């Protein structure tokens, strides 16, 4: 019950034509947004009962952006071959005006010439949906890779006879992979979702970009963090103190004491404790997997409150000596960030909400697990004092955090700032 099977190709062609006709970018963006919103509403209506759905905007997105097509091999039909096929199929005279116009196009693009030729020779209303067009193009590509032209001719004839002039023009442009609309890839991706361009850059497969980023509310952060999965924590960027006030638009920030401990993440779910490192290495054996095994896990099971059942945390692991009540540089753990609590995901929420909810995760208990000491500062003098205190305490440096910063795994920059003497 794919949505593409209920959407006529004529509607998409008309939307593209409207986008091209409009001069200002605002009208183009409005048309694309309206079409996408209608598609999303129809998708929501259709899939009310189904739980797992693979349907997405891919069927239309691939056509709108032919230059990103990788599932389909080269069609093998360039401008000259397409002109020859059009001349042969339409039974136009070899020496006629139409044939000369199609063949002699100064190898005013070929699509416009084909549209003008077919305007008085084709129907006014097509009946081919997006799914049928995609199937026909897939068949054409598969047959081209199999060295067979008769079925390619048959498919092209079917498309010609079951399409209008505008649809034929758009299909020719798609085959040539030269769909120009006045809006680049970046604008279309931004209109689609707020985190589509970078995801597509990360992975050169359009299907996942359209599938995972279907709900506009669900950002990249929610999908990048999953239960029982090892993600890539981000890191701060070294910056000079002299311009620290310029890094955050002179806004209030949080100062944290840097700890010389390995970055590591963990997930708690009932009597299950999963552990992972920054590089994805698994070390659940070191601290065990259940409260009845290991050294650190047994002492933290009671720390978590009853209100917390499923949670994900990330922090720094170091070593602690209770005898001198000291932290030894390169078992105690520090918590300074929460990625997910309960069903809801905290990735979208800014750092302020994460800090607010940290206090409600578990009661701090020195010796095994607690919350890393931190304060709020808004002046350079406070930063200097914190750095001096850290140096007096042998700490490597200072962490500067912007409350407005959001969780962006696998990225460098943002509010994560590292301050060290230099």
């Amino acid at each position: 019950q794919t949505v593409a099977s209920h959407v006529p190709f004529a509607d998409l062609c008309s939307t593209l034509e409207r986008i091209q006709k409009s001069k200002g970018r605002a009208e183009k963006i409005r048309h694309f947004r309206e079409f996408l919103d209608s598609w999303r509403k129809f998708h929501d209506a259709l899939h009310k009962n189904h739980k797992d759905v693979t349907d997405s905007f891919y069927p239309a997105m691939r056509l709108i952006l032919p230059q990103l097509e990788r599932e389909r091999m080269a069609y093998g039909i360039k401008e000259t071959m397409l002109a020859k096929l059009y001349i042969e199929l339409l039974n136009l005279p070899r020496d006629g005006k139409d044939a000369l116009k199609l063949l002699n196009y100064r190898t005013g693009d070929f699509a416009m010439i084909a549209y003008f030729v077919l305007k008085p020779r084709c129907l006014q209303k097509g009946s081919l949906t997006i799914q049928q067009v995609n199937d026909l193009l897939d068949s054409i590509a598969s047959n081209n890779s199999a060295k067979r032209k008769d079925l390619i001719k048959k498919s092209l004839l079917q498309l010609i006879t079951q399409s209008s002039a505008l649809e034929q023009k758009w299909l020719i442009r798609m085959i040539i992979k030269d769909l120009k609309l006045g809006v680049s890839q970046q604008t279309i991706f931004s209109v689609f979702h707020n985190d589509a361009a970078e995801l597509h850059n990360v992975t050169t497969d359009l299907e996942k970009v359209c599938r995972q980023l279907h709900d506009p509310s669900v950002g990249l952060s929610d999908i990048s963090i999953t239960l029982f999965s090892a993600f890539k924590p981000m890191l701060a960027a070294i910056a000079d103190i002299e311009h620290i006030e310029k890094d955050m638009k002179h806004q209030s920030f949080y100062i944290e004491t840097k700890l010389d401990g390995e970055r590591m993440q963990m997930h708690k779910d009932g009597d299950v404790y999963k552990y992972f490192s920054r590089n994805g290495y698994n070390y659940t054996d070191q601290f065990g997997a259940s409260p009845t095994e290991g050294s650190l896990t047994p002492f933290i099971h009671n720390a978590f409150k009853a209100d917390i059942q499923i949670c994900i945390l990330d922090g720094e692991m170091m070593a602690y000596n209770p005898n001198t009540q000291t932290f030894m540089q390169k078992t105690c753990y520090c918590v300074f960030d929460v990625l997910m609590v309960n069903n809801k995901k905290l990735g979208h929420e800014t750092l302020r909400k994460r800090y607010e909810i940290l206090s409600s995760i578990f009661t701090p208990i020195p010796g095994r697990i607690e919350i890393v000491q931190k304060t709020q500062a808004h002046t350079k003098n406070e930063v200097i004092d914190a750095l001096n205190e850290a140096i007096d305490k042998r700490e490597e440096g200072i962490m500067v955090k912007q409350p407005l910063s959001i969780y962006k795994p696998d990225k460098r920059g943002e509010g994560w700032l590292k301050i060290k003497p230099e």
Binding site: H6, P8, D11, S38, K41, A45
Partner: peptide, 26 residues
């Protein structure tokens, strides 16, 4: 259920130019 049709819901400054004839009669 419905269908796809329902959801789709398809000042300034004046300028003057003089034009003088340059014929014998003038």
């Amino acid at each position: 259920m419905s269908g796809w049709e329902s959801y789709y819901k398809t000042s300034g400054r004046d300028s003057l130019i003089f034009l003088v004839d340059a014929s014998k009669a003038m």
